[PDB]
Amino acid sequence: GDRINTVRGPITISEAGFTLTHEHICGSSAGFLRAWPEFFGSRKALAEKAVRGLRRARAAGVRTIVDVSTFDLGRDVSLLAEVSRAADVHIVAATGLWLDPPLSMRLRSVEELTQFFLREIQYGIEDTGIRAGIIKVATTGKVTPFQELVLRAAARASLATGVPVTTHTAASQRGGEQQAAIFESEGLSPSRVCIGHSDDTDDLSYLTALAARGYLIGLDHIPHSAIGLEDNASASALLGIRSWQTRALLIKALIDQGYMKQILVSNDWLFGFSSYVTNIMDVMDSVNPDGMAFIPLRVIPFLREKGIPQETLAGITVTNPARFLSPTLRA
Amino acid sequence: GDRINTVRGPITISEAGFTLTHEHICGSSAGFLRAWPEFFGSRKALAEKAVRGLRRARAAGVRTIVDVSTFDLGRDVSLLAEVSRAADVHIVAATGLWLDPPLSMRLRSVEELTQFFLREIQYGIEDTGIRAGIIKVATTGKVTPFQELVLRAAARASLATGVPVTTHTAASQRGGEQQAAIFESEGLSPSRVCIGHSDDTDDLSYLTALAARGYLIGLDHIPHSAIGLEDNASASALLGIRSWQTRALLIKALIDQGYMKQILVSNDWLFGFSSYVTNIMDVMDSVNPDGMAFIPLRVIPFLREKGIPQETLAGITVTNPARFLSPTL
Numbered sequence: 001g002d003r004i005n006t007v008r009g010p011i012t013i014s015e016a017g018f019t020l021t022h023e024h025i026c027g028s029s030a031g032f033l034r035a036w037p038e039f040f041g042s043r044k045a046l047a048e049k050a051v052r053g054l055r056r057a058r059a060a061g062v063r064t065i066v067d068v069s070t071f072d073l074g075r076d077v078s079l080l081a082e083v084s085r086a087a088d089v090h091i092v093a094a095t096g097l098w099l100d101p102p103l104s105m106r107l108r109s110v111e112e113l114t115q116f117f118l119r120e121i122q123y124g125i126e127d128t129g130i131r132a133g134i135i136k137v138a139t140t141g142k143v144t145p146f147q148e149l150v151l152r153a154a155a156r157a158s159l160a161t162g163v164p165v166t167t168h169t170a171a172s173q174r175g176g177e178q179q180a181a182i183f184e185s186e187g188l189s190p191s192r193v194c195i196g197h198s199d200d201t202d203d204l205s206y207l208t209a210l211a212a213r214g215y216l217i218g219l220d221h222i223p224h225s226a227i228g229l230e231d232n233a234s235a236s237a238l239l240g241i242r243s244w245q246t247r248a249l250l251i252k253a254l255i256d257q258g259y260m261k262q263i264l265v266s267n268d269w270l271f272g273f274s275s276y277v278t279n280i281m282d283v284m285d286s287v288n289p290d291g292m293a294f295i296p297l298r299v300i301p302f303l304r305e306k307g308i309p310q311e312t313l314a315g316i317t318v319t320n321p322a323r324f325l326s327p328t329l330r331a
Numbered sequence: 332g333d334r335i336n337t338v339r340g341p342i343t344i345s346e347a348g349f350t351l352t353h354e355h356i357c358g359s360s361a362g363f364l365r366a367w368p369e370f371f372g373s374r375k376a377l378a379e380k381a382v383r384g385l386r387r388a389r390a391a392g393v394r395t396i397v398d399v400s401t402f403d404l405g406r407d408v409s410l411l412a413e414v415s416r417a418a419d420v421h422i423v424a425a426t427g428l429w430l431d432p433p434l435s436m437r438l439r440s441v442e443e444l445t446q447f448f449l450r451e452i453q454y455g456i457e458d459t460g461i462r463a464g465i466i467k468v469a470t471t472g473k474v475t476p477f478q479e480l481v482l483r484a485a486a487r488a489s490l491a492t493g494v495p496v497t498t499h500t501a502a503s504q505r506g507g508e509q510q511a512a513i514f515e516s517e518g519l520s521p522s523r524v525c526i527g528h529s530d531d532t533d534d535l536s537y538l539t540a541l542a543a544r545g546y547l548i549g550l551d552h553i554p555h556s557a558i559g560l561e562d563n564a565s566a567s568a569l570l571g572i573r574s575w576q577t578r579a580l581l582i583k584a585l586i587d588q589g590y591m592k593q594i595l596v597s598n599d600w601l602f603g604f605s606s607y608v609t610n611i612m613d614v615m616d617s618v619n620p621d622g623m624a625f626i627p628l629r630v631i632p633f634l635r636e637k638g639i640p641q642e643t644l645a646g647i648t649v650t651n652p653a654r655f656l657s658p659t660l
């Protein structure tokens with residue numbers, strides 16, 4: 001109803017405040033942080049870096065982040081709880097599956113996957129008793145048969161619990177349209193779904209058409225940009241070469257079209273990143289030293305400068321995430 | 332030098348006894364047992380099944396198993412330590428990588444992989460202080476570029492520590508030849524290497540040639556013969572069409588060639604198996620109700636009746652594993 005799960009327990013949605021709806025503490029792989037912590041220097045070093053970063057985000061006004069790391073992104077909810085408590089920032093944990101499921105997940109049926117997502121929402125993650133407040137799913141442009149199982153299981157878990165679904169897409173492939181079709185074939189309301197990484201495209205017809213159907217639009221890659229780093233193949237492939245201003249103007253664009261209630265904004269940042277080339281984190285941190293504070297420190301003023309009312313910005317950063325995260329469906 | 336690391340700490344070579352050199356407590360995926368234990372009923376149920384299975388094997392003469400589950404096979408060394416202590420059977424843990432590395436492993440350099448294998452051997456696995464006593468690697472027929480990195484990292488870790496390397500091969504594609512070539516390019520002695528799943532072929536010339544170069548030959552799929560399951564659409568690509576006796580005779584064949592010193596025998600069994608289709612464990616347990624006791628209860632007597640002397644059988648099951656596992660440079 002009006003309470004959501006965080007890694008410190010249930011909170012009322014009024015307490016969430018300024019919420020970043022797509023972030024990561026650490027982007028990794030199942031088991032990896034605990035098997036090889038010195039990849040990140042140490043577990044302690046990683047935790048301290050996350051606490052420093054989250055504390056700066058809190059100074060800048062952030063009160064909640066949603067960590068959309070799944071099992072196969074190496075989600076360690078014990079780490080999430082430790083850094084949440086120390087930074088005093090709410091963290092919502094995720095269930096679901098991203099793009100790197102191990103065999104023990106890849107070979108499961110839609111029914112089995114449904115019961116796994118329900119366990120993480122209704123019972124707890126691992127043996128921690130920490131419950132997920134969101135379901136994260138990911139597809140390639142053309143959805144694979146396994147990915148379709150994952151989306152149907154996510155829809156079924158969402159209908160049984162009321163918690164929302166948020167996606168990874170290839171926006172240049174208009175990936176959201178095939179995702180939306182599968183979700184609706186399962187009876188899932190578009191108001192329970194955020195189509196993420198949507199600022200990766202400048203195709204406003206695609207974006208507005210999803211928004212008109214009641215989907216939430218995740219403009220969550222705003223600081224991702226390898227401009228100046230064109231000589232870095234791996235960084236360019238990851239971040240793109242569109243400017244952060246270009247990405248942010250899509251926020252204005254969707255407001256101007258009348259869809260401010262459908263916008264969710266985030267940084268998609270992280271404090272460690274093992275599921276890409278070595279030292280990618282140092283490259284990203286040089287691009288955006290603000291980290292997760294990039295949205296409140298850079299983007300919000302940029303948009304106010306362009307004339308967007310304060311009330312509108314507050315609605316996008318506070319009201320929209322609250323409506324989205326509040327469990328809404330079967331009691 | 333003459334101490335072997337187990338999940339309960341170091342043991343002397345003489346303590347190892349009858350050793351099964353390729354086994355699994357649970358074939359899974361990294362993080363999976365912790366995240367979804369009810370897939371196996373419960374963690375408790377899996378543990379209890381494994382303790383009964385190990386005690387059965389112990390009553391059939393087994394004293395040590397080598398669990399060749401890697402990180403990406405969901406190795407949980409805390410589970411191994413628990414079941415080892417309750418069954419009074421030594422378990423040697425593994426490092427290395429099998430065929431399901433996640434992105435955080437697949438994108439690593441040979442230098443990075445070498446350091447991870449070294450951490451698990453020299454420092455410990457996770458935060459447990461339990462050190463690996465063997466390095467497990469796997470390839471599919473024609474070695475992929477990443478698999479080649481794994482094999483080279485395994486060779487370098489072995490050379491720094493004396494710990495042996497054991498492999499998963501496609502024997503029908505003669506995959507050991509490519510593995511050996513890579514190991515030798517690194518300066519690794521063949522006597523530190525077991526080429527596994529070798530009973531999956533009838534090509535005796537292929538096996539003898541490897542043995543003559545000094546490789547250990549892992550005849551570890553003996554009970555994966557099934558016989559009777561052609562109605563199944565997932566128990567013929569995992570299990571066999573040749574009888575277990577046929578596989579077992581390869582042991583005798585190699586003995587007769589004068590290579591009994593080169594032979595390692597095991598079951599490649601497990602007590603849980605999530606990295607396959609659902610309910611596979613039920614199929615497997617019905618086909619081989621002996622589990623890890625299949626080697627001592629069926630294969631040893633079969634060889635004895637074919638005229639292999641006790642002393643030779645003890646050499647294969649006690650002496651060879653001890654020489655293989657004892658860290659050596």
Ligand SMILES: C[As](C)(=O)[O-]
Nearest residue numbers: 024027073168268
């Ligand atoms: C963990 As990601 C690079 O898919 O947002």
Ligand SMILES: C[As](C)(=O)[O-]
Nearest residue numbers: 355358404499599
């Ligand atoms: C874990 As296996 C079936 O490759 O020996």
Ligand SMILES: [Zn+2]
Nearest residue numbers: 167168169197
């Ligand atoms: Zn993503």
Ligand SMILES: [Zn+2]
Nearest residue numbers: 023024068268
């Ligand atoms: Zn992300």
Ligand SMILES: [Zn+2]
Nearest residue numbers: 498499500528
């Ligand atoms: Zn194998």
Ligand SMILES: [Zn+2]
Nearest residue numbers: 354355399599
């Ligand atoms: Zn095996």
